[PDB]
Design a binder for this molecule. Structure first.
Ligand SMILES: CC(C)(C)[C@H](NC(=O)C(F)(F)F)C(=O)N1C[C@H]2[C@@H]([C@H]1C(=O)N[C@H](C=N)C[C@@H]1CCNC1=O)C2(C)C
Ligand SMILES: CC(C)(C)[C@H](NC(=O)C(F)(F)F)C(=O)N1C[C@H]2[C@@H]([C@H]1C(=O)N[C@H](C=N)C[C@@H]1CCNC1=O)C2(C)C
Lengths: 299, 299
């Protein structure tokens, strides 16, 4: 059982490089529009406290240099949707997949294609944390890299990368340019809310462990949903809803372990610790696999 | 630091399916040749005790169904090289990347594109263990999925998947069909040997921690390579080769910590433990990041 990303080829064919003045970052080229973070327009002075509408009205199409590989795409119009710039180009991307823009909820996972200078560098799986950050791997020039899920040849874009917080976690927007979380695209100190652990995902991962032949953490105890939630909240875990219990149904039926029996296992893990043992090679409880992720990989 | 795969697009464009009889696995289409595991020619009875030369002599080009999606590629020749079948087809793949076939060493990492019926399913990073197995994630029909690294648009193919051992780890060949390790492509009792920890990768991880300011474990001692190797083996760690010392060169130069001084630091951790301290937020020493992986993620 590995952390597994979606194949990235459908997204690689959409990545381009966008340069405005001194700043170069990545854009997403779909049909005849390039989407990118609007902070590309800022100078190093503007970026400390930008007035974006005032800055954008002062730009011309020719201020934007868009490069797909070696070929320059001519920008023929530009507008702003929240924190995302939409550059209209005179060329349609023949590699445009079937796609949708979606806003994901905390606890959902997605694949990130990290890119620099319009060229894909790496792919990995992330979860939207309950505090609306992501624990990514992004360096200078990674902005405009996107996160996505793939469902039968349809790419659902859910994240565009904008910034790194002082704690090393990351923040960005949906493809409508709205940030996940209380963050802003301004270079100034910003912290996130206290994070919590994605309970339904920890349980899904415990089931993945059982599917892969590990049972050391199970016990013979039971719990009610409410009593489990009291202990979960005490340990800074998210509430488990009846919808979550239902979503875990396939995994419970495959292993024969009732959801509330798995909750009693997790409760014991939280109260006693792992005593130096590991689950699926991990010394900590892993919360970045959803129930769907486990099913997709295990079957 | 997290496991980051290479973008899979250049490999996705080379994946096809190969069917003999009712058995379908994956193949790799480069120029006008498709490479796949030779056990595609076996029936469920043959696999228990196959005579591959006799099975191949009964086959003709017209017994092999090669498909890119649902589009058939006409087979015009077939031959066996070690444990791989090479099917010459009448069409050169226009998506063939610049590529090399390489045989990797234990400890080296690579990205796996897990595929079923020629359709990519997911991508993840793997390390070749010292016992010549990988801790993959593979289901029925995954054989012919490949592992690869990418360097300046050149894809180095290093692994093709063949089998799962009873401990749940995986075994396969290079693209010339030579197995890694003592395994054979027959359904008969086989077992992975005892494994060891990849010392060169643990050292790379310690350098990564130093780069990020986590350096409490740096001591005031040094060691010789030979003395270190003899101690490491007593802790079930791999000895270092001269090539390992050289691949740590860039990280040693970046940090100013001599390789042998870092070896002495690791020796102290092995002999006295970590004393409840963590390194990079972990109580365990990670051994599946190579020196290149550490550099790749900070560059
Ligand atoms: C890291 C930092 C001090 C720079 C700053 N953060 C804060 O100012 C904070 F305190 F608000 F977080 C920050 O990220 N930015 C400052 C400026 C943009 C963003 C930015 O440079 N984005 C990079 C896109 N190419 C990706 C970054 C680079 C390092 N790793 C990444 O992921 C905007 C918020 C408008
Ligand atoms: C695991 C199994 C008990 C079935 C068996 N293993 C052993 O015989 C061993 F133990 F010896 F290794 C293994 O038999 N196979 C039998 C036959 C091929 C191989 C096989 O089915 N390969 C699959 C390719 N599509 C990938 C597998 C499927 C499950 N997960 C995988 O990765 C060959 C060795 C010729």
């Amino acid at each position: 059982f590995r952390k597994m990303a979606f194949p990235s080829g459908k997204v690689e064919g959409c990545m381009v490089q966008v340069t405005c003045g001194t700043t170069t970052l990545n854009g997403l080229w779909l049909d005849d529009v390039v989407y990118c973070p609007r902070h590309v327009i800022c100078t190093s002075e503007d970026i400390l406290n930008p007035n974006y509408e005032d800055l954008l009205i002062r730009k011309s199409n020719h201020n934007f240099l868009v490069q797909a590989g070696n070929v320059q795409l001519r920008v023929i119009g530009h507008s702003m949707q929240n924190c995302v710039l939409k550059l209209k180009v005179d060329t349609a991307n023949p590699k445009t997949p079937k796609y949708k823009f979606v806003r994901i909820q905390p606890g959902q996972t997605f694949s990130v294609l990290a890119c620099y200078n319009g060229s894909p560098s790496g792919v990995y799986q992330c979860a939207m944390r309950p505090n609306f950050t992501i624990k990514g791997s992004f360096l200078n020039g990674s902005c405009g890299s996107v996160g996505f899920n793939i469902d039968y040849d349809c790419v659902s874009f859910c994240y565009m990368h904008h910034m790194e917080l002082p704690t090393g976690v990351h923040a960005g927007t949906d493809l409508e340019g709205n940030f996940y979380g209380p963050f802003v695209d301004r270079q100034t100190a910003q912290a996130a809310g206290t994070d919590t652990t994605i309970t339904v995902n920890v349980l899904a991962w415990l089931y993945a462990a059982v599917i892969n032949g590990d049972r050391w953490f199970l016990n013979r105890f039971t719990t009610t949903l409410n009593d489990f939630n009291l202990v979960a909240m005490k340990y800074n875990y998210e509430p488990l809803t009846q919808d979550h219990v239902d979503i875990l149904g396939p995994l419970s039926a495959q292993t024969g372990i009732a959801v509330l029996d798995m909750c009693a296992s997790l409760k014991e893990l939280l109260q006693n610790g792992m005593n130096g043992r590991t689950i699926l090679g991990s010394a900590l409880l892993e919360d970045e696999f959803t129930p769907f992720d486990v099913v997709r990989q295990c079957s």
